[PDB]
Amino acid sequence: MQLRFARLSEHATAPTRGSARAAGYDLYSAYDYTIPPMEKAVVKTDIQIALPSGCYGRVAPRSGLAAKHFIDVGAGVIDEDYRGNVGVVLFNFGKEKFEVKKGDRIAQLICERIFYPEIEEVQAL
Amino acid sequence: MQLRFARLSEHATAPTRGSARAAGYDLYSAYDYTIPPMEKAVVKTDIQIALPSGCYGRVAPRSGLAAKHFIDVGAGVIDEDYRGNVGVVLFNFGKEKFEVKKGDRIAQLICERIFYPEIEEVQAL
Amino acid sequence: MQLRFARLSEHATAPTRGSARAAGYDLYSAYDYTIPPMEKAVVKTDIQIALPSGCYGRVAPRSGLAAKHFIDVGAGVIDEDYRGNVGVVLFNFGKEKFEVKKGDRIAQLICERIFYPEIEEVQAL
Numbered sequence: 001m002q003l004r005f006a007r008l009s010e011h012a013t014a015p016t017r018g019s020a021r022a023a024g025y026d027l028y029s030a031y032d033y034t035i036p037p038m039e040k041a042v043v044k045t046d047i048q049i050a051l052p053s054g055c056y057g058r059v060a061p062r063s064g065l066a067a068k069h070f071i072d073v074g075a076g077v078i079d080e081d082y083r084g085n086v087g088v089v090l091f092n093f094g095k096e097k098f099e100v101k102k103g104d105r106i107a108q109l110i111c112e113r114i115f116y117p118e119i120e121e122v123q124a125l
Numbered sequence: 126m127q128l129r130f131a132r133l134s135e136h137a138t139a140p141t142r143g144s145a146r147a148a149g150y151d152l153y154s155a156y157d158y159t160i161p162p163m164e165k166a167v168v169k170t171d172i173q174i175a176l177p178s179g180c181y182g183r184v185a186p187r188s189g190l191a192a193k194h195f196i197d198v199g200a201g202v203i204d205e206d207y208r209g210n211v212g213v214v215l216f217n218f219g220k221e222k223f224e225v226k227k228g229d230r231i232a233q234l235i236c237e238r239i240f241y242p243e244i245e246e247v248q249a250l
Numbered sequence: 251m252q253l254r255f256a257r258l259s260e261h262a263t264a265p266t267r268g269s270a271r272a273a274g275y276d277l278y279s280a281y282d283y284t285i286p287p288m289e290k291a292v293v294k295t296d297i298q299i300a301l302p303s304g305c306y307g308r309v310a311p312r313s314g315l316a317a318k319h320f321i322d323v324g325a326g327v328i329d330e331d332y333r334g335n336v337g338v339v340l341f342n343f344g345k346e347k348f349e350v351k352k353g354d355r356i357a358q359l360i361c362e363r364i365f366y367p368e369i370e371e372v373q374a375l
């Protein structure tokens with residue numbers, strides 16, 4: 001039932017959630033990145049996570065980066081069994097480069113509840 | 126279990142959902158906006174919402190605006206305890222300006238079920 | 251319940267999920283498409299789906315197409331009662347054209363659990 005994580009390097013920061021009813025934990029960059037205009041980057045967090053059973057982890061955008069700096073998050077579907085280093089794919093749609101520094105919050109991680117259905121083909125629904 | 130909302134000005138339109146089984150309620154703009162090509166705008170609904178317990182409110186794209194006009198929704202994670210004016214971050218990736226008129230539907234609001242886990246750091250998963 | 255689907259033409263490919271704990275089933279293009287830089291396309295799968303009760307179907311990005319080729323998915327909210335041809339709205343934000351060949355996996359379908367709340371207006375929350 002808890003979200004567990006481990007730091008893969010000392011550059012990682014433990015994810016935080018200030019409000020008890022916020023949808024997501026903050027994810028912090030482990031490194032500095034410069035993302036030119038209309039360009040993408042995979043920002044490494046250097047953490048691995050073990051999500052609660054019954055959800056996947058969605059890497060979702062922070063609201064202020066989106067509205068103020070035209071930053072979006074691509075990809076974003078972390079499967080329940082993924083134990084690698086969590087990467088945030090950021091898209092910079094703004095006309096200026098966007099700087100990430102180590103320790104900056106750059107996305108949030110949401111435990112999205114889903115079904116894992118078996119699939120069946122039929123002739124017509 | 127219901128979704129409650131209040132109008133913050135008389136320009137607001139109550140969200141609607143025509144089908145009992147549609148994923149989202151329609152969100153309507155409270156104002157006119159002109160969003161140039163490759164630009165973004167924060168479109169105010171002038172409503173506040175109180176989402177049902179156990180979900181967050183995802184502001185998600187309308188399907189036709191995306192396929193027909195290349196409009197996408199940025200940000201989009203409204204925490205369950207957010208009581209301010211609901212804003213829709215629209216991105217216009219088309220080659221022509223996109224007009225929003227007051228009263229237009231410009232996104233949909235989905236009650237996405239999530240866990241709110243506690244977090245635990247371990248040395249290694 | 252299960253996810254049922256039917257092929258609407260012989261060009262469709264049954265969706266697949268390699269891992270038991272992957273969040274989504276891969277969706278396959280039924281046709282070739284060439285998506286120029288900064289353009290979008292509606293890629294038809296020629297399948298119809300019947301999603302389990304209690305979810306909508308989100309068309310979500312494949313992680314590799316996003317990080318390696320700057321491909322994103324627009325629209326993406328398939329209501330639980332939709333019985334038409336599933337279309338994937340791909341956005342190519344890359345500097346080079348992106349080729350979809352028939353039979354290529356171009357998105358994933360996630361059964362995102364949601365509430366279907368009734369709506370109530372109040373004077374102020």
Ligand SMILES: CC(C)(CCCOCn1ccc(=O)[nH]c1=O)NS(=O)(=O)c1ccccc1
Pocket residue numbers: 042059074075076077078079082084085086087088089313314315317318
């Ligand atoms: C094996 C792949 C496809 C996925 C590896 C990461 O899988 C987990 N995962 C999935 C989505 C995501 O956004 N972040 C993340 O950490 N490699 S990659 O294309 O280079 C890529 C790296 C980081 C983030 C997204 C994609």
Ligand SMILES: CC(C)(CCCOCn1ccc(=O)[nH]c1=O)NS(=O)(=O)c1ccccc1
Pocket residue numbers: 063064065067068167184199200201202203204207209210211212213214
């Ligand atoms: C305090 C902030 C970060 C968020 C205030 C709104 O938070 C609730 N919220 C969150 C996501 C969203 O898409 N819409 C919304 O109404 N301010 S802002 O950057 O200007 C911004 C306003 C509207 C939408 C997105 C961002």
Ligand SMILES: CC(C)(CCCOCn1ccc(=O)[nH]c1=O)NS(=O)(=O)c1ccccc1
Pocket residue numbers: 188189190192193292309324325326327328329332334335336337338339
């Ligand atoms: C009636 C419409 C609005 C929606 C018809 C498809 O509704 C189901 N649906 C919804 C979201 C989605 O991404 N794919 C999909 O198949 N027509 S359309 O704008 O041309 C469009 C077609 C395919 C995908 C997105 C949009």
Ligand SMILES: [Mg+2]
Pocket residue numbers: 011
């Ligand atoms: Mg170092």
Ligand SMILES: [Mg+2]
Pocket residue numbers: 068069
């Ligand atoms: Mg700023």
Ligand SMILES: [Mg+2]
Pocket residue numbers: 072073197198322323
């Ligand atoms: Mg997006």
Ligand SMILES: [Mg+2]
Pocket residue numbers: 193194
């Ligand atoms: Mg139109």
Ligand SMILES: [Mg+2]
Pocket residue numbers: 112113237238362363
């Ligand atoms: Mg969800």
Ligand SMILES: [Mg+2]
Pocket residue numbers: 318319
């Ligand atoms: Mg490739």
